[PDB]
Design a protein around this ligand. Structure first.
Ligand code: HEM
Ligand code: HEM
Ligand SMILES: CCN(CCc1cccc(F)c1)Cc1cccc(NC(=N)c2cccs2)c1
Ligand SMILES: CCN(CCc1cccc(F)c1)Cc1cccc(NC(=N)c2cccs2)c1
Ligand SMILES: C[C@H](O)[C@H](O)[C@H]1CNc2nc(N)[nH]c(=O)c2N1
Ligand SMILES: C[C@H](O)[C@H](O)[C@H]1CNc2nc(N)[nH]c(=O)c2N1
Ligand SMILES: [Zn+2]
Lengths: 405, 405
């Protein structure tokens, strides 16, 4: 065949070849001797200019003026600007295209069918922590939209030679506190124990419930982060109930509507946007399987199983599996009742399959991380399980970055 | 570099040093990860000699006698035979060691905690397809053991340069027929349509049910294959019923007790055993989820869901998930009732975690393929989902080989 990875779907028997992976200029963690695809985090003048040129070239193809006069005049401004300053700045339309392209490029994201519909708020004029807060509130208001969620990103000023970074310290805009107890256990979300404790060191007065919304810790360049409490009425939440298990409501479980990731770096054309929070909507398994059932998260499986009167003393009852199903159903049912957008793992995966086909035609491939794309319950019941995937890093991209502290 | 391997549930880290022993490239490169690919893309005396000495060294090291007269003399024998004849032969105790190690080293196998407990039948004095059948019947009978299943392997004569291979054309020793309809559909197991047709064509009289056991097509070097029908009493089957849903048994479903793979090549010390069928016992998800619920296998989700009166019109009822669970529950129950060995995915993945730990201590690592280890339902509900894994090829190994037609 062709000299590019051959990619097979074992359900359908169909074959494609990824030619896009050719465009990757950044190495992943695998070698011929060993595959490291399952690790979660694997561990410049001419350099900037060349990322810059490539990015501008991508922009000009996307509007189809490749080789044009406008294209070559932009390349020249970018070098001029780097020549005299070490950096450059993006046109507004370049930032919009780049932000959508970073989403499109994210191998781990199963919601990419939506990649073309992203509201980009340009906040590159922001000059204080107070102003970041207003921008974030506006973001949350627009995105939440009383339950009819809308994808969005708000982009704060880029990293700049020898000035401090803009950062949001929280990993998401909405997170529940986790309080370490005398007996070593955690009340709330154990994932958020470090951020919780940071908030307290910075003057936050902590509550003591299981679902306390954290304040944001926002850092403008060369300053200590400042603490901001989110108006409760801006944080839409969904109380959890089950469509037929009437006791489920009695458990007092809830989840917030808006997933908004705030600690990633958006890299476009070599420019680095250290604060660039983005939001979409939830796939139901993120709440109902990982957040509520991981043993290191809320860990509610056994409590639910006991309420369902299952035999929890033996693996072979499938008590875990039965409980997880029902918790997932409650999540979907409750969001539905509340009119808050949510997508189940079947509908998400079907639409990711359609994404794959669309991208096969547009770009000759789609970077995808199979372990993250396949959901955490009912894997082989989804069509993605049966689909081979090629994982690689393209840019623009969202990257992890180290923590500000 | 040596990889760091993190468990995300317990926060523990290990380093894999065993991967340095890999002499054999996988599908990945720094530009792209191809770990989700099922099959490899591709599929002299000095090189045999070095795989040979390496394997001889592994064996003596394993019985402690590394550097003894015996050890040096055995290296000379291997050297003398290769130098003169281009090939060599294993001693039975080496073959036994090498077969156990190949299982040990299989990165896709979740059952490796059992690796040291393997009955090895040496069938290298086999000269006809007639004799392969007898050995195969004895393997089935031994390994079945009236339901108290015992892991086993039978090793037929190695490949030899001058001639065709010994081969078992079937992919397993027990497979159900798949009969294509003139209108595209299939009766029985659509995975087996092609072998089914080969059987008819070599003169099998076909059945017309959903669970007809195939004859074996056994091939001695450079001869047409011959057909052998397995005596029904050797093939232990389990009717499927549900512990509480009485209509479930009405579905007429059943599975065989003995999973015995018969198309993989066993490689030991550079020598290749093209026919080396091996067997153990089932993990219940292999039947319950994949074989019965894959859309391209028996595809019974809908029918179960209908019998359970679930709402089938909408993915967000989680009908697929609920039916899958019950079906896996039926398998486990029916195997337990029939007193036939099986293991559920929770118990299996817990055992594998233990294995990871034994192997860390014994060898500095454990090659494992995360997409194959994590089960096809309730992924994140098992500990393996949260465990990073490093995939690589050690030898002895089980490999794929081309189909003999
Ligand atoms: C429109 C609805 C969307 C859905 C349902 C969705 C779904 C998901 C899910 C389930 C994950 C895996 C998360 C996990 O297990 O922790 C994910 C990863 C991701 N998605 Fe989305 N996505 C959506 C929109 C977005 C948007 C708007 C962006 C950015 C503009 C985005 C970027 C990402 C990135 C960067 C990751 C990877 C995070 C990491 O590597 O840690 N997605 N997506
Ligand atoms: C004793 C119980 C055993 C259990 C429960 C078990 C379980 C499994 C499972 C569930 C798979 C994945 C199969 C699939 O999804 O298609 C598998 C793969 C495998 N196991 Fe086992 N295993 C067992 C014993 C053995 C033995 C005795 C051998 C060889 C002597 C073996 C060698 C393999 C190999 C080579 C694979 C990989 C097949 C491939 O890559 O296509 N296992 N194991
Ligand atoms: C629970 C944490 N998720 C990343 C997982 C992670 C990664 C690295 C280190 C960690 F500790 C944890 C966050 C995440 C990221 C991206 C998307 C989603 N879920 C969503 N539905 C979206 C969030 C923003 C737009 S869609 C969650
Ligand atoms: C269902 C198919 N499995 C092979 C997967 C495969 C690989 C390549 C191409 C395919 F079409 C399919 C068979 C298999 C292999 C190894 C182990 C098992 N299951 C078992 N429990 C055992 C079989 C033998 C010992 S344990 C199944
Ligand atoms: C070790 C393993 O990579 C890790 O637990 C992954 C697996 N797949 C995932 N998939 C998604 N979508 N989210 C995750 O956090 C993870 N965790
Ligand atoms: C494409 C993907 O690798 C493929 O569907 C794999 C995934 N994980 C698997 N895991 C097991 N145990 N058996 C399988 O056949 C597969 N199939
Ligand atoms: Zn890889």
């Amino acid at each position: 065949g062709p000299k590019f990875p051959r990619v097979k779907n074992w359900e359908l028997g169909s074959i494609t070849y990824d030619t896009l992976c050719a465009q990757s200029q950044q190495d992943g963690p695998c070698t011929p001797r060993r595959c490291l695809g399952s690790l979660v985090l694997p561990r410049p003048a001419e350099q900037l200019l060349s990322q810059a040129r490539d990015f501008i070239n991508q922009y000009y193809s996307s509007i189809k003026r490749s080789g044009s006069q406008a294209h070559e005049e932009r390349l020249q401004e970018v070098e001029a600007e780097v020549a005299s300053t070490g950096t450059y700045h993006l046109r507004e339309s370049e930032l919009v295209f780049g932000a959508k392209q970073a989403w499109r490029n994210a191998p781990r994201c199963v919601g990419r069918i939506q990649w073309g519909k992203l509201q980009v708020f340009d906040a590159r004029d922001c000059s204080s922590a107070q102003e970041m807060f207003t921008y974030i509130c506006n973001h949350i208001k627009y995105a939440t939209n009383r339950g009819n969620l809308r994808s969005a990103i708000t982009v704060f000023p880029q990293r700049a030679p020898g000035r401090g970074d803009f950062r949001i310290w929280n990993s998401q805009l909405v997170r529940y506190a986790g309080y370490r107890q005398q007996d070593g256990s955690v009340r709330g979300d154990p994932a958020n124990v470090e951020i919780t404790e940071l908030c307290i060191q910075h003057g936050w007065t902590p509550g003591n419930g299981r679902f306390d919304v954290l304040p944001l810790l926002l850092q403008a360049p060369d300053e200590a982060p400042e603490l901001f409490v989110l108006p409760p009425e801006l944080v839409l939440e969904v109380p959890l109930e089950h469509p037929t298990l009437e006791w489920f409501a009695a458990l007092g479980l809830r989840w917030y509507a808006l997933p908004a990731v705030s600690n990633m770096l958006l890299e476009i054309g070599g420019l680095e946007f250290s604060a660039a929070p983005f939001s979409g909507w939830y796939m139901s398994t993120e709440i109902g399987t990982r957040n509520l059932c991981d043993p290191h998260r809320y860990n509610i499986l056994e409590d639910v199983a006991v309420c369902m009167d299952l035999d929890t003393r033996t693996t072979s009852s499938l008590w875990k599996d039965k409980a997880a199903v029902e918790i997932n159903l409650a999540v979907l049912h409750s969001f539905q009742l509340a009119k808050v957008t949510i997508v189940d793992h079947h509908a998400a995966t079907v639409s990711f399959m359609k994404h794959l086909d669309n991208e096969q035609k547009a770009r000759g491939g789609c970077p995808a991380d199979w372990a993250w794309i396949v959901p955490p319950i009912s894997g082989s019941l989804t069509p993605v399980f049966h689909q081979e995937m090629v994982n690689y890093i393209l840019s623009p991209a969202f990257r992890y970055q180290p923590d500000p502290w």
